[PDB]
Amino acid sequence: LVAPQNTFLENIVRRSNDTNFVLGNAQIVDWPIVYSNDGFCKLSGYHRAEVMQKSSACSFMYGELTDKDTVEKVRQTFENYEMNSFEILMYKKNRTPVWFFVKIAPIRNEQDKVVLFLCTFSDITAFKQPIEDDSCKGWGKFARLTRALTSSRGVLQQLAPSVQKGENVHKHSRLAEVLQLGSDILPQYKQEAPKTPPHIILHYCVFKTTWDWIILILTFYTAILVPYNVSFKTRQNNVAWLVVDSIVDVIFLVDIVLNFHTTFVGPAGEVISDPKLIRMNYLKTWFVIDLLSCLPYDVINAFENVDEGISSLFSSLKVVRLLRLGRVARKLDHYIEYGAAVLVLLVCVFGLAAHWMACIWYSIGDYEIFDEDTKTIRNNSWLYQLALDIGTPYQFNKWEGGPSKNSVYISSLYFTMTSLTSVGFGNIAPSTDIEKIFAVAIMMIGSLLYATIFGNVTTIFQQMYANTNRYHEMLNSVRDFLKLYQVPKGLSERVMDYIVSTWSMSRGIDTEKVLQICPKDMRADICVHLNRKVFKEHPAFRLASDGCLRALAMEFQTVHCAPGDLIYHAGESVDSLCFVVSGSLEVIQDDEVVAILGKGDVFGDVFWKEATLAQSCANVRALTYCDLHVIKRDALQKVLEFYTAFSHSFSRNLILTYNLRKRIVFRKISDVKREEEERMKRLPPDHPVRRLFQRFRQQKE
Amino acid sequence: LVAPQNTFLENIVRRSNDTNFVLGNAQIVDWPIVYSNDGFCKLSGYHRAEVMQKSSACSFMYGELTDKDTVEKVRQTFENYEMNSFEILMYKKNRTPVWFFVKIAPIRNEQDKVVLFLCTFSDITAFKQPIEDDSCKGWGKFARLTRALTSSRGVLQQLAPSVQKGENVHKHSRLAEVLQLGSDILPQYKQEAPKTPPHIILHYCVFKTTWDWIILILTFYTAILVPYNVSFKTRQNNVAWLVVDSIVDVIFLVDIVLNFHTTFVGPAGEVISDPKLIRMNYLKTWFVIDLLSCLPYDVINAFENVDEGISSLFSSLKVVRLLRLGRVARKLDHYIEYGAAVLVLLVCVFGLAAHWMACIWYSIGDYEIFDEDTKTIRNNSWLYQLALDIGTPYQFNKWEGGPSKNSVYISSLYFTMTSLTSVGFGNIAPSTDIEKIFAVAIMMIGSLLYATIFGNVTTIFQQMYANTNRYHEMLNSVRDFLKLYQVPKGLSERVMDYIVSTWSMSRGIDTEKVLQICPKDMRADICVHLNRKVFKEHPAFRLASDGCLRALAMEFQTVHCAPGDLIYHAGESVDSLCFVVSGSLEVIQDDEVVAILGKGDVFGDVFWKEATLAQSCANVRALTYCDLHVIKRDALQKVLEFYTAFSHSFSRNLILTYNLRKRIVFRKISDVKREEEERMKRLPPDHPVRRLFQRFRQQKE
């Protein structure tokens, strides 16, 4: 976990080595000071807050003895961007003059430009011509001046009292640290990556990734071949296996050496790349184990024809080559997390265990069958029962070969395989004490490993089907509720269809939760992108600043309306401007069509001007699958009143397509025709309606 | 579950035994009264509220007959801290004089000091010289005085009327209870631990813990050896087993005895340590069972050579030694909770059941094989089939020994093992009716136990992988959302990287939930520790009291910002002071660097002075992995206005590094150079811009 980060301050403070620095801007008139340091504030007496936003020429610290020639030099060097180091008397808060040495070194940028200046400071007050302005005593002023040069008097020039005429080297010693700032100028105020130290290969590189698989394949091959070779009485009539063994040893030794020069993930951190402790970590962790596993003890003895005693006993222990599984033990944490890879690992270890146990079974049978000097055939042993069953039984003149190795290995593997899988055909079965003990052990191991496999498979299935079961349960609950509360089909069908359709599109994701997971800036940018369709299109938003745009994108809400669904029923309070972005809607007023809205149109009421709620005067109905972007009145009013400059143009530029509060008046053709027909066929006691007419006239007046 | 608690009040009220006491302070002038009692208030007529904060010399209760000599005695004893008991006439609310006896006994402290006084009270009005001030009648006053001495007239001195001249012992009887207060003075007002009663060993001690494992090992050994010994016709040719059996019996009897003197966890409480019922609990729970299991019935009969009839029948029942599993039945609740220990327990019980069933199988075979007086060999039995298969078949001259016990036991164990593991090689198989019935039983038991093992393994795997599956599901949901809503890669990469990185560091812990779980004081202290980095460092907080410090630590929030993430975009409302504690940030104004912030710097606006919101005038961008401590404006204003004294120094001491509301003005070198170049190359109808200039001048005026 590493990101491209600007390492300006860290590198500069590490490389300063008990010095002081002030950063200045390079592209502004008079070069305002952009940063100061604790050492600078301590030496000058000026606080960082009161020294910020000051000219980098340090004119704020000038006085009587400052030289116009020095002013010219600093100005010309600043305007020329050249490395230089001056010494000029400077003035602190109390105006008391003290000698001073300076050095200026601007730093470039990755885009081939100069952005930041850097002026360093040094004190030579105790090692220059003594100058005083107003002090109680000359020696007192000298002591005061000397008390400020602790950095110079320290280990930087601690050998000065022990020697004489050291001024010829004190300046060089002081400037040596300052000249190192070019090393910290290498990032050049840019997103410099964490470059690795030389002769170290990152462990997430392509080469390392493709090497790990080869090392795993080779360790698998050696784990398979070692017990077979050690137990099945195989001969060395085939030389090429020795050559392949030698190449295997070479590859493993090369990997062992390469494990020194490779970064590793630190348990107490994230990434460690320090060669002074990487090698120590590897050596203390696994180097001894891998080296002892990676040496062919018998190879040298066989090549040199050593004595058949202690040397042969040492050589015969090549079973120790099996512990090469340290590589797999290391690697298994890379892919142990996957649900579906643990099953493959378990199947592979099942097969490997089957091979090992079959090899042990042959070893037991071969140790058992003969009776050594007793010359008894021991017809009890399975290795004789199989020789009788399969054909070519034993005979003597020396004893015959009986079964061949090719069939013997397959038979042993079949027996171990049936024992592990717990099928148990039993045509080959243990018969003596040692075989029976081994049988008890093998049944126990097989039962446990089978339990592990079954557990893993059940976990995979359950974690696969949990989500579908949850969805089905929710649907069943909704159906049961709707059946219980006697809701008719005309609404039940719509509810079930809406639930099914919304699940089909939204899948198992919650937009609110996804938004809340991310931080604030990510939330802002995601919302701005989601409402880009309205923002870029509608002309009323073309004069929006970043802050108001984000504050509006936070509140804008997207609503999907299916055809047939009403949005604003007649008489409902209207409190939300809504921009149509897709599909089309219509407005119905007194069971008639009075306007039709399409893409890029907004309908509602002018909230910031009306400042009151009104009843909706017409119904709005969906026609096609539309997308709406509604915004509540309160949030819009708050944002608009916060951004007065934005409002002064928003009010002028936003014109509503249809205003819901206002309603139109009109007459019907059928109504006027009926009125004319009635008039074609055309009160003294009408006191109540006379009073009604008088009241209506008074109200209209 | 016991904690170090001060048992002052509980012990003193238990030991008072129907008396009264008033606690007084020992390190304050005039010794204000720190606590009173119901008995004291009832007898004196003064309420606790109106008697608190009064001199411990009881001068508030003095009157005419109080003696200056008694005042001198009480003062000198109080200043000398000495045990003493006086009697002096005291005055109640109605001023009526009544005789009184007092005793003062200060109590020390664990730090070798005196902190609390203790003055006891007693009434001797009815047993002293009668004194009256103003009463209706002498006998009436006598009755009134006698009516107040019920505590003395009770069982404390109930034998006084039955005897004469009892005043010589009444004082001793009254003082005996008061003198016991030294026992309650033992805690000395300190965190006294709940010391155990003598001759009782706590059951969570090291000795008990290390003894439990030994008793479990020995019960396992006896459970393994008992059925083998009882069934396999083993002989006593090896004496040492009898000695080991004797030592086993001694150890178990010692454990049985030791179970009397050991505290046990009470089901209806937490810890019970009362010896008068601990022994009863053990006896009613398991003592009879353990004692009957822990006696070698046959040992005494064998040693004494008892008759081979009823005594031998009694002795032959040593199978009853098997019920020693009561210890494991008790103990299994200690380690039943662990998920990974139930598997080991199940494997052990599997092995033990296998051994038991193999022993039963041998018993059945040996009972079956021979036909008793019929002399029939019964070639059907497995114990003859095995003797034919393995070699050395039976022969007669008496009948031959056939197979040896060493092979017979292994064969029986192998048969039971295959039956239980459900492998079923079948080279040894039941052949008669009894064997077939036992086979049906053994298959059923094996199937059920195998089911239990598989269930346990599946539960372990699922509970191991649930968390990883949940994390993967959440990541997949976020990826699916981002794919659905067409967000570009430039934002998708950042979102996915943020989620992965935040999970990597935070693991599966929610800071808000962890905070909410704990109580209020723990929450406050945890928050104070979490913000210690700012609190101890920033000088503006060096004058903070406990209440304001906690009220600020409750609202301070920690924010981790990755490099490249913006915090305050230009034009956004600024409402939060934020202290930088690690890394470094920069402020960008008009695409330029104007200030740089490091460790121990704060940027925002002076809320308590401005009392209004302002638009941010510059962008702030992260450079390195930084930690921010932001605080909202409302909470800070509320706390500051609550703590006026704290505010009067906070405003003076807090100086902002960069003020976002304030914005600096400047010119660019390129801009001024271009302006000069344009000027080097250098209106009557300009009425609109003349009007613009006039309006600008009017606005500036």
Author numbering:
A (entry chain A), B (entry chain D): 10 to 406, 412 to 696, 704 to 722
Source paper text:
The Eag K+ channel was chosen for study because its pore is gated by both membrane voltage and intracellular Ca2+ through separate molecular mechanisms.
Of the six positive charged residues in the S4 helix, K1 (K327), R2 (R330), and R3 (R333) are positioned at the level of the extracellular membrane leaflet. The fourth positive charge, R4 (R336), occupies the gating-charge transfer center inside the membrane. This region of the voltage sensor is formed by F261 from S2, which caps the top of the gating-charge transfer center, and by D264 from S2 and D299 from S3, which interact with the side chain of R4.
